[PDB]
Amino acid sequence: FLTVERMVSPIESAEDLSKQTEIAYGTLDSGSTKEFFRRSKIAVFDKMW
Amino acid sequence: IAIAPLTITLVREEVIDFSKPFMSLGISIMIKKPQKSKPGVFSFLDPLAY
Amino acid sequence: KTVVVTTILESPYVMMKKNHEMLEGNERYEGYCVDLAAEIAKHCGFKYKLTIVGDGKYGARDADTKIWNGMVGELVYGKADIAIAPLTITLVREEVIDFSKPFMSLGISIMIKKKPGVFSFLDPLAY
Amino acid sequence: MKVGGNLDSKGYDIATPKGSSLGTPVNLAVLKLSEQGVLDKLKNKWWYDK
Amino acid sequence: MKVGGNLDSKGYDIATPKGSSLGTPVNLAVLKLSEQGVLDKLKNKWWYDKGECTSALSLSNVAGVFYILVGGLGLAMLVALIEFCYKSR
């Protein structure tokens, strides 16, 4: 229990959020952020989209 | 021209012309993703070998 | 007319027999490509003579002089009638000669290298 | 999940009618695409990325 | 050991001169050979047939303490017999 509790690391960056799946993440239905996510070429943002 | 996952066979080569294969594949095995099995009755002896 | 089969020496593809010196002809060679060529010759009913490429190179264009080397060069310049060897199918070779349907599929792969002490129970604490 | 390697070897290719002028250009285009690495990009996009 | 999958896809093919009568039937021959399965037979025959080839704690991890225990037992026996012989004499 204690080792697992120590091992967990809070998400402090984009790819930590992206590779992980337990905690969801969202964006506005219609906005510049959604366009950026759609028309992106970097791998991390691609799999996020 | 036929652009689709068409398998290259001897008969098809006999009738039509095939380019070099753009993607290779074979026969493989799909099994259900393994799950945590129920521990055995005498599973407390597991840390030490018999 | 007998067909010259031009080959590059490479294991398992072709090898030198242990008794290659006393033997003569295609029996001097044994390998993957010789068996493949035997099957092809049986299918097409022609006699073939095995010959190893002189320079022992797979083949690559030299942009300064534009002369093919290796088995591709042997085929282009008429020294060979058919090549049965581990020759990769690429663009440069494709535009100059005819490649059959690939008989052996391959790719880049990773190769890795694959007993505690008697008094190993003392490791957790320093000496 | 997929377990083990491939039992046999097969490939998917682009088909062209017998005695046509598109066979050789399509063939060399397929090899140029494979050597360039676009095909692996497409496979990764349509299988893993998406 | 080879580990993982092939990163890309290539192949080995029979090469013949441009515009040769030997191309079409050698291609038919290699395809027929692959479909007949003899090609896989050749692959297995010279790659494998002529080839030349846990979580729980094991006893080897604790063999040293067993050796120490047996040595201590033997030393205790030796001491006991020494004392017995000395007292008897």
Curated annotation (Swiss-Prot), chain C:
Question: Which residues of the sequence carry a binding annotation for L-glutamate?
Answer: 86, 88, 93
The places in or outside the cell where this protein is found are: Cell membrane; Postsynaptic cell membrane; Postsynaptic density membrane
Induction record? Down-regulated in the pyramidal cell layer of CA1 in the hippocampus by global ischemia.
**PTM entry text:** Palmitoylated. Depalmitoylated upon L-glutamate stimulation.
Effect in UniProt of substituting residue 91 to Y: Promotes dimerization. Strongly reduced desensitization
Tissue specificity, per the record, is:
Detected in forebrain. Detected in dendrites of neuronal cells. Expressed in the pyramidal cell layers of CA1 and CA3 and in the granule cell layer of the dentate gyrus.
- Residues carrying the site annotation Interaction with the cone snail toxin Con-ikot-ikot: 61
- Describe the subunit structure: Homotetramer or heterotetramer of pore-forming glutamate receptor subunits. Tetramers may be formed by the dimerization of dimers. May interact with MPP4. Forms a ternary complex with GRIP1 and CSPG4. Interacts with ATAD1 in an ATP-dependent manner. ATAD1-catalyzed ATP hydrolysis disrupts binding to ATAD1 and to GRIP1 and leads to AMPAR complex disassembly. Interacts with GRIP2. Interacts with GRIP1. Interacts with NSF via its C-terminus. Interacts with CACNG2, PICK1 and GRIP2. Interacts with GRIA1 and SYNDIG1. Part of a complex containing GRIA2, NSF and NAPA and/or NAPB.
Q: What is known of its domains?
A: The M4 transmembrane segment mediates tetramerization and is required for cell surface expression.
Q: What does this protein do?
A: Ionotropic glutamate receptor that functions as a ligand-gated cation channel, gated by L-glutamate and glutamatergic agonists such as alpha-amino-3-hydroxy-5-methyl-4-isoxazolepropionic acid (AMPA), quisqualic acid, and kainic acid. L-glutamate acts as an excitatory neurotransmitter at many synapses in the central nervous system and plays an important role in fast excitatory synaptic transmission.
Additional remarks: The postsynaptic actions of L-glutamate are mediated by a variety of receptors that are named according to their selective agonists. This receptor binds AMPA (quisqualate) > L-glutamate > kainate.
Q: Which family does it belong to?
A: Belongs to the glutamate-gated ion channel (TC 1.A.10.1) family. GRIA2 subfamily.
* Name of the featured protein: Glutamate receptor 2
What organism does the UniProt record list as the source?
Rattus norvegicus (Rat)
Span within the entire protein?
414 to 544 of 883
